[PDB]
Amino acid sequence: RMVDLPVLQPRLCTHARWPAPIYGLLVDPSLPSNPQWQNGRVHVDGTLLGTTPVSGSWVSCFAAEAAYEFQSGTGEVATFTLIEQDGSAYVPGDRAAPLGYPDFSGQLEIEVQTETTKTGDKLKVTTFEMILGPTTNVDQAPYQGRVYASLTAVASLDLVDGRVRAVPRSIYGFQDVIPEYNDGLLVPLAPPIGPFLPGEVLLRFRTYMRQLDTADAAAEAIDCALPQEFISWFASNAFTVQSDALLLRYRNTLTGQLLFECKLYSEGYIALSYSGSGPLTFPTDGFFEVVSWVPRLFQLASV
Amino acid sequence: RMVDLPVLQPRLCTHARWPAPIYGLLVDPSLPSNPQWQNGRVHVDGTLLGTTPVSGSWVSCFAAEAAYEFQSGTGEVATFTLIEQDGSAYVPGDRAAPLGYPDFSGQLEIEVQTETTKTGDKLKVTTFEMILGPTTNVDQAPYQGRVYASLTAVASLDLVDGRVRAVPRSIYGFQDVIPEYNDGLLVPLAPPIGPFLPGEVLLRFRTYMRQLDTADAAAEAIDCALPQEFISWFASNAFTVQSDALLLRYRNTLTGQLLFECKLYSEGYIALSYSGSGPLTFPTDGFFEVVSWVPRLFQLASV
Amino acid sequence: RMVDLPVLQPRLCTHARWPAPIYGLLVDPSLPSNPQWQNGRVHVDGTLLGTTPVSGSWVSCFAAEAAYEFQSGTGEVATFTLIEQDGSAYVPGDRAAPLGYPDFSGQLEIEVQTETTKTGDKLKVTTFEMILGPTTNVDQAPYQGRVYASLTAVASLDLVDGRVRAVPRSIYGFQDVIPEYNDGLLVPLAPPIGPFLPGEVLLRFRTYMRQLDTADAAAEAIDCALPQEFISWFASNAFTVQSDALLLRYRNTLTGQLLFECKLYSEGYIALSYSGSGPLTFPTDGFFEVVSWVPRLFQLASV
Amino acid sequence: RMVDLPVLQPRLCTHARWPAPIYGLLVDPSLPSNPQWQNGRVHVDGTLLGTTPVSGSWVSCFAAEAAYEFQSGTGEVATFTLIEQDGSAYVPGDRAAPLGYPDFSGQLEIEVQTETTKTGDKLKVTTFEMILGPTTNVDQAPYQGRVYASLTAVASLDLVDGRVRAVPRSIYGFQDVIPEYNDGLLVPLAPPIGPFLPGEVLLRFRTYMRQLDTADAAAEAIDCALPQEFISWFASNAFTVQSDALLLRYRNTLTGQLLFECKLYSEGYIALSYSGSGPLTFPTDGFFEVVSWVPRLFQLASV
Amino acid sequence: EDPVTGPEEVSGQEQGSLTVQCRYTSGWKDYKKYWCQGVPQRSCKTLVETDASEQLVKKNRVSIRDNQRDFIFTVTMEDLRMSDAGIYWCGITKGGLDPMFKVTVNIGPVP
Amino acid sequence: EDPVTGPEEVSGQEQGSLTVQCRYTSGWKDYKKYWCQGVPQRSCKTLVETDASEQLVKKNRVSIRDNQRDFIFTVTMEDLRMSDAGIYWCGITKGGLDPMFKVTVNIGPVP
Ligand SMILES: C[C@H](CCC(=O)NCC(=O)O)[C@H]1CC[C@H]2[C@@H]3[C@H](O)C[C@@H]4C[C@H](O)CC[C@]4(C)[C@H]3CC[C@]12C
Ligand SMILES: C[C@H](CCC(=O)NCC(=O)O)[C@H]1CC[C@H]2[C@@H]3[C@H](O)C[C@@H]4C[C@H](O)CC[C@]4(C)[C@H]3CC[C@]12C
Ligand SMILES: C[C@H](CCC(=O)NCC(=O)O)[C@H]1CC[C@H]2[C@@H]3[C@H](O)C[C@@H]4C[C@H](O)CC[C@]4(C)[C@H]3CC[C@]12C
Ligand SMILES: C[C@H](CCC(=O)NCC(=O)O)[C@H]1CC[C@H]2[C@@H]3[C@H](O)C[C@@H]4C[C@H](O)CC[C@]4(C)[C@H]3CC[C@]12C
Ligand code: NA
Ligand code: NA
Ligand code: NA
Ligand code: NA
């Protein structure tokens, strides 16, 4: 069956690298042209790349067996022995980390369900600080299945060790650079997004992350190559891939007017022909439609 | 084109009523048989019911214009003037609330991005407590677009009014009962799930919510009728519906062994013919496949 | 078009494995007969093998994104995330390293442009020490795109992270053995040079590297199969290959006297028929001329 | 045989005036329009002009017999008796200096292999400072075969006199003006590049040199008329020159799209018709192709 | 300056009675006062509420009377049972969030 | 604040013994400690290494024992020969660049 796409508008879709709605659609040649994002990566034939999960609820989260301890001078320290978020054992293999593990850098505030032995309480939700990267002095190694988090406290919180699911609360010092997956060593990674033709630029689906910032109030943008609905759409359909890219049309939902034509490369990224120097945003209430297969050298009309 | 289903395993899918992975698949005749869940409701022809959103990042969340104030004896008080989660205006209409608003009861901890006026700080993430239902003394009216939240504080947090996205952090005193949608008055609701034939019971997709509990450590279960991936799958395809139900087969992914057959009613819920009196859980690493259209009175093989 | 060669003299050519002029031309049966050099490898039809670049300015150099930090007891530490020397992204593929990366062993002194934040200074040229191989305790992995270097310093140099081009300054403890390409694991390599007929030995183009040695003042020789001009000559012309080898004559430029006949094998190396036991050097101011195609079994006249 | 050009891309070529890759391709009428560069000068028939060498490893380097001594109040002082870089004697003749000698001005850091008598060391690489020009008070006379370099030191380095090859480490106070070739006296020079037609400007192949700068972090650009690969291409092929110029087309390697047409004058420089006043850069992943011979007055299409 | 205060912990005995005094600031005089039961706080079940007057109101075993001179409304729980134990709240009804104060009630048998 | 320290120069005698103490900071307690030989520094030949425990390890004539209370691992070289002379290193195994301290070992005859 020939590849098709859902009629979903981007503004009603889920971001693939941070669990939030998609708010923006744009091209920006001033940003890095070939990002090596590890989440939100799928081939059109349905092969997931990097750490990309099928469910958007796995994005920028992790699951682990948690071991807690109090360290004087630092506070409550958590050692997370990672597991895949469905409960299957994490085995180091041909990807950077467990599925859905964050693929960006900064200090991430995470939330976990904790059980305490203190009388009068039983189940709580505790916020931990976890440094992702680019470099840390904590020796994070999610590739090996071990990450560390901490929280300032004057005494032990008396937490009970056990299974946890960690969800992201905020990001501090965000950088769109892959984190420390293996204590400074490199890991199997999905390759950089690309290549592009002359004049082609990556189409970006943008959301904004909850952040901690002591001076700047501007929202923190993060981009992904495809909405999560498109990621699971390809994973479910398992289309056969014919050419190197698909010619798509982005049209206004109500009128049908064509907003731009673009190429969905089979490697999982959308390209537009745009020669401008600054960002160019597009309406988020349109829809994509598959036109046909095209070769790599197919020249798009400029937008 | 004849109705088909994604090959996705339930354990890799997203829950439709609480933003978490699906962990369980079961029937339980001791639970309410015709729940009136407002999220996770879609017809097989693609019509969304109740407050069901397409994106899982909308589930049990809301967006609003936030106004903050300090009230002695209460704390920091938030008045949320609701808006649809994509920014389009919320108009009270033929559903209970904005799309994705919680459809359960209890005390909900929510997180929002807050801006402060304190010198040296700017952007923080603040946890608020918001009572959902079943009844409140707060006059919650999400149907009208106004809800109230609070957090204990000894003084004002010096928050700046502005736009927010609120995501759920934990549930306290959970009840699977619709919340106070309109200050005690009734609202347009999706009908109860059903009806079922004699001996037919609802198939439940289960996750467990982060909870606050001072005594019991047992996980808090919440069920939905379909994975969020299935809701958006039907919403995208707009299938033509022929009969009243679809005969489905749930099979093991690796071996192919048939685990059970079931009926996906066109109204958007799955029924099993089940002769037991107690709960029966099923493996979550299987897949659903459509067999054919069947009439309402079609008799299933018992489980 | 029949293969021809430039009349350029070896003494006026560029070495293909260390960026220096060619100073010697010789055969030596006491050295390893079948070296697996990764630079300076080209087929006569123009196919580049291993990490061989076309431009001589790429030879034994690398380009990277540099990350700096100070570590007491070690000094200023550089982490080089490799990139191809033209700025295009380096992707681990069907060769050992980025094009032009050193294919020998020892401790390499490299030079990079560094920017500092120290008041009164801005741009300097800094020498780093980088271990190549044969084995290291550093986990060098140029195949994955990450290598580490250091330089002794009593305090931080306050270097700014950024892009660099690294050129070789000197070699310490040189060994003509492929370096640690992948943290001890194997990588795709160009095969050993060969095979040769009985009595045939490899013709070596020799230069001498800037070296560090605390006792021995004798120059450090390094050999390559072809001058860099011949590599770019074959890469540019894309000749059609007829037989297994080309019969060459090395004649004096002024008088024309024939110095030796040799076979240029299609795999990109020259063989001479030489029965001696010790080294035999030849004048470097001669010229090569193509005579005709010959089969692999063509027996050369002894020198 | 009609003149043709290799399909080599500029970004994969070697710069002809500084030993580095080519990073930029541009025209800039605000720069000196008729430069008298002495390196990187060749006729299309293969005739080398000025000090231009065939091998790129000779570019901005020199060879000498070195004499070292310590002078209190100055430091270690080096007297270099220049020699041609292949070891043949340098004789003052019809050019400015030995082949490859730097043709720009500023303070050049050079590196040479030095042997020491100090116990515990033997072979080192020593960095010297050498003033090139435009004017010096040290009486540099590379045309005569004698230049001086020095490095500050509190005591003698115990250096041994001997043969050296000097390679450039960094440039300080760079000026694209010919150095002091003969102690203030005039020398035989390659003529200024030109002439051009009305509206024609010189095409520049640009690299950036390792520099010393205490305030400005902007890269230090240096331009040449042709890539070093083109110089050795004309020197090796010895084409017959017919007209005053060659009509060339610069096309993108992947698509084949025409970027501009230009005139390669037989005197060894490329002209584009460009009426702007500021710089105009071009993509570096194209290739040049010969169209035909044209007269000097052939009018190019504007770019 | 809390809007409404009371005892943090009170204890009664089976078949006995207990009394709870809820003090409030003068501004809440003309507001309805109530006594509610259970957690979560703001979904508790109102057992008895005044009509903003000083009339005594009795519903089942709970009584309430508002003293609008001393600004204290008094709750009385009669014929106590073990199932009466739990968290209660002094409450003042307003639009939105009510002034509320937590009262823990323990019930035991007679020795 | 150096990670690992030791003697800059030690001298032994033929058929004799020498001992080398490498002190490290507390943070490196649970890391493997080693004694390696030769130059270049970071391509040296590891003679003996611990398993990050306090167990004594011996290979041929070289021994290693990590004291994880005083943060000193002690290297012992027995039955020395003149050919044992050279550059050695106290080492702590890590990802990337190892903490290493240069130890020069001289061996002479007995008078
Ligand atoms: C106590 C918590 C329930 C509350 C919770 O954290 N829910 C997640 C959410 O609200 O998003 C339990 C219930 C089910 C548990 C998960 C499931 O048992 C599946 C899985 C099993 C692995 O052994 C550990 C990880 C992992 C993934 C478990 C982590 C902890 C969970 C999530
Ligand atoms: C300050 C925050 C960004 C941080 C954040 O809260 N992100 C949510 C998350 O991380 O999940 C801003 C950035 C974009 C904003 C949203 C968009 O502007 C669209 C929309 C506009 C409406 O006026 C208010 C709601 C709504 C939906 C906005 C809520 C607040 C958002 C989400
Ligand atoms: C600051 C230096 C310029 C000085 C220098 O190191 N020149 C090299 C030499 O003299 O041989 C900059 C100028 C241009 C830069 C290069 C170019 O931008 C191209 C390329 C871009 C990649 O992102 C990083 C590597 C790489 C290859 C860059 C390395 C650093 C360079 C070479
Ligand atoms: C000690 C150095 C070798 C190390 C070195 O400096 N290599 C240059 C590099 O690595 O680029 C020796 C080895 C061969 C020597 C060269 C050859 O003997 C040929 C020639 C002879 C002339 O009398 C002096 C210059 C010149 C050209 C010599 C300069 C010094 C060289 C290059
Ligand atoms: Na920020
Ligand atoms: Na190491
Ligand atoms: Na400068
Ligand atoms: Na109220």
Swiss-Prot record, chains E, F:
Topological domains annotated Extracellular: 1-111
Induction: Up-regulated by interleukin-4/IL-4.
Domain called Ig-like V-type: residue spans: 1-106
Subcellular localization(s) per the UniProt record: Cell membrane
Tissue specificity remark: Expressed in myeloid cells. Present on the surface of macrophages (at protein level). Highly expressed by alveolar, splenic macrophages and bone marrow-derived dendritic cells. Expression is increased following aeroallergen challenge in macrophages, mast cells, and eosinophils.
Highest taxon, organism lineage: Eukaryota
Disulfide bonds: 22-90, 36-44
Post-translational modification remark: Phosphorylated on tyrosine.
Annotated region described as Plays an important role in murine norovirus (MNV) binding, given as residue ranges: 20-26
The protein's role, per its UniProt record: Acts as an inhibitory receptor for myeloid cells and mast cells. Positively regulates the phagocytosis of apoptotic cells (efferocytosis) via phosphatidylserine (PS) recognition; recognizes and binds PS as a ligand which is expressed on the surface of apoptotic cells. Plays an important role in the maintenance of immune homeostasis, by promoting macrophage-mediated efferocytosis and by inhibiting dendritic cell-mediated efferocytosis. Negatively regulates Fc epsilon receptor-dependent mast cell activation and allergic responses via binding to ceramide which acts as a ligand.
Protein family according to the UniProt entry: Belongs to the CD300 family.
Assembly and interaction partners: Interacts with PTPN6/SHP-1 in a tyrosine phosphorylation dependent manner. Interacts with IL4R.
Protein name: CMRF35-like molecule 1
Entire protein: shown range: 20 to 130 of 337
